[PDB]
């Protein structure tokens, strides 16, 4: 019955939008193990851009989140079918291409993002008042 | 066996320092129910000062934290012995006076703060780079 879900991301400056996404992946099936992958500082910088928190800070915050069962930190930047076999992952859960092969296989579970809740935007709140 | 712990605070812009505190209160005894009280916007402003997130935003974030079993939102600003009886609270868990009466009664459990991890300070990080 237990379904293994893998959700990777930068998880920089974790906010409610991030945690609703993790809650969503956790609840994709009735009995799950949610594995979260945290990307490395170097690869995030090289491919995405500026990260505020280090790998260790981003990883420690996630350990406090109710929905997170296991953590791979750091995690590979690109998911491969080897990786899926290595960790016995049944579905990859991410927002939406690079995930075509997963959707083709029956193993992609779309999860949704929440905007405006970002730590970035809460400073703007502090500031559109100054 | 189950021990009811009450930890109140503003929980504005929840960071790792906040979550380590909640983890600490949760683990005060082997079997606990951790109740978290979230203070109102008006009373925080009036007694503490400027709050960034609303009551509802601060409360929703806490629902995602592994250690939080129950939430009182909003919560009273001052704990009273009536309140303790009302919720069957065995210990109040807070950092450290206003908690003398609790310590006198055997019902105060000190928890520790973590500095420098504050959302405030992570902007300074972004900025001591500009
Ligand atoms: O959070 C992302 O967009 C991401 C996920 C997996 N690998 C790299 C980046
Ligand atoms: O977080 C605090 O300092 C607080 C705790 C309980 N009542 C008011 C304020």
Domains of chain B, start order? 3-127 (3.40.50.620)
**Residue whose CA is closest, atom 5 of ligand 2?**
B9
Report helix angle A55-63 to B16-26, nearest 10: 40
Q: In whole angstroms, what is the distance from residue A38 CA to residue B125 CA?
A: 21
Q: Match 């029956």 to its residue by tokens.
A: A106
Q: Is A99 in the pocket of ligand 1 (CB under 6 A)?
A: no
- β-strand partners of B93: B109
Q: In whole angstroms, what is the distance from residue B121 CA to residue B16 CA?
A: 12
Closest to A34 in 3D by CA, of A78, A92, A75, A77: A92
Q: CA angle, corner B37, sides to B63 and B32, nearest 5?
A: 75
Residues in chain B: 130
**Residue whose CA is closest, atom 2 of ligand 1?**
A9
Q: Peptide bond before B102: cis, by omega within 30 degrees of 0? A: no
Closest to B1 in 3D by CA, of B33, B26, B23: B33
Q: CA angle, corner B42, sides to B40 and B43, nearest 5?
A: 70
DSSP class of A89: -
Task: State the CB neighbour count (10 A cutoff) for residue A6.
Answer: 26
User: Alpha helix (H) ranges present in chain A?
Assistant: 16-26, 41-47, 55-63, 81-87, 100-105, 119-127
Q: Is A66 on the interface with B (CB under 8 A)?
A: yes
Entry resolution in angstroms? 2.2
Q: In whole angstroms, what is the distance from residue A75 CA to residue A71 CA?
A: 9
* Burial class of residue B72, CB neighbours in 10 A (0-12, 13-18, 19+): middle
| Technique of determination | X-ray
């Amino acid at each position: 019955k237990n379904v293994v879900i893998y959700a990777d991301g930068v998880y920089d400056m974790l906010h409610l939008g991030h945690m609703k996404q993790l809650e969503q992946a956790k609840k994709l099936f009735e009995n799950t193990t949610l594995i979260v992958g945290v990307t490395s500082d170097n690869e995030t910088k090289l491919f995405k851009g500026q990260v505020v928190q280090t790998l260790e800070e981003r990883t420690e915050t996630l350990k406090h989140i109710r929905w997170v069962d296991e953590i791979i930190s750091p995690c590979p930047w690109v998911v491969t079918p080897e990786f899926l076999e290595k960790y016995k992952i049944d579905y990859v859960a991410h927002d939406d291409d690079i995930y075509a092969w997963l959707k083709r296989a029956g193993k992609f579970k779309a999860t949704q993002r929440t905007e405006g809740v970002s730590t970035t935007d809460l400073i703007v709140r502090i500031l559109k008042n100054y």
